[PDB]
Design a protein around this ligand. Structure first.
Ligand code: HH5
Length: 284
């Protein structure tokens, strides 16, 4: 039971608490209702995100603070990208659709980053799709406002090396990992711990050094004793992605966050010359 919603049903466990599909009692509308598992600072800052509207961002409809509980109300979409890539594993997602989704996601990130809002925890479970061929990012801005098993697979290397500063580049990294996973039908870096995560990145991209990443050796959790692995070609990592897609991915996965392509620059990349917006085959 809820005093403002009916037919409340559990969708999943999210980063912050249970996620429900719910019907607004007044309007009849179906929404995603997120219970935040337990602060005044967070309420004003998340409430600012109610203004932050774009076709490729999941709309934060409301912030409800009642009975000393906090709920976030979002626009409901029928599938996430995790489920869609599982459902598409035999065939793969068609390349035009991968390109459409990556393009759209970059437009959402470019919008949020232009408004000084980061995600910091992008993952297939917070990328949501609809029947019309759109993809939208959920939960932008929540990590900065708020502070089972956490997925590390999309975490940028500076975060894993204990940098307590964030930048836009953390989201480009995450999205490049997602881009690779859509193409290969395998997670790029499926670490089960922070050091396994780090070392999976190093064994693909090479152990970073002061040449490719000035400042890295002074990172808080950098250890001079890290093994020194050589870097692999993207040609072996993401076949059969073409030269253009491999060049763009390379730029999204630079070690130094400052060298990583911006979302705005990535939209101009030659990979998107032939972008279209296809219809997905969604089984709901
Ligand atoms: N179905 C679904 N799941 C989640 I996680 C969502 N977050 C925002 N809208 C959502 N819709």
């Amino acid at each position: 039971f809820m005093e403002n919603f009916q037919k409340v049903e559990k969708i999943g466990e999210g980063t912050y608490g249970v996620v429900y599909k719910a019907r607004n009692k007044l309007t009849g509308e179906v929404v995603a209702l997120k219970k935040i598992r337990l602060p005044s600072t967070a309420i004003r800052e998340i409430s600012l995100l109610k203004e932050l509207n774009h076709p490729n961002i999941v709309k934060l409809l409301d912030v409800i603070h009642t009975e000393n509980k906090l709920y976030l109300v979002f626009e409901f979409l029928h599938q996430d990208l995790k489920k869609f890539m599982d459902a598409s594993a035999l065939t793969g997602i068609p390349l035009p659709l991968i390109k459409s989704y990556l393009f759209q996601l970059l437009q959402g990130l470019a919008f949020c980053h232009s408004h000084r809002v980061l995600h910091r925890d992008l993952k297939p479970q917070n990328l949501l799709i609809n029947t019309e061929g759109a993809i939208k990012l959920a939960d932008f801005g929540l990590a900065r406002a708020f502070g089972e098993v956490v997925t590390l697979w999309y975490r940028a290397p500076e975060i894993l090396l204990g940098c307590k500063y964030y930048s836009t580049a953390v989201d480009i990294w995450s999205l490049g990992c997602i881009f690779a996973e859509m193409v290969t039908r395998r997670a790029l870096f499926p670490g089960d711990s922070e050091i396994d995560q780090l070392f999976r990145i190093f064994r693909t991209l090479g152990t970073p050094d002061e040449v490719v990443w000035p400042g890295v050796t002074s990172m808080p959790d950098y250890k001079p004793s890290f093994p020194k692995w050589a870097r692999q070609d993207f040609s072996k990592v993401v076949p059969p992605l073409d030269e253009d897609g491999r060049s763009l991915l390379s730029q999204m996965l630079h070690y130094d966050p400052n060298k990583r392509i911006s979302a705005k620059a990535a939209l101009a990349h030659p990979f998107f010359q032939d972008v279209t917006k296809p219809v997905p085959h969604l089984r709901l």
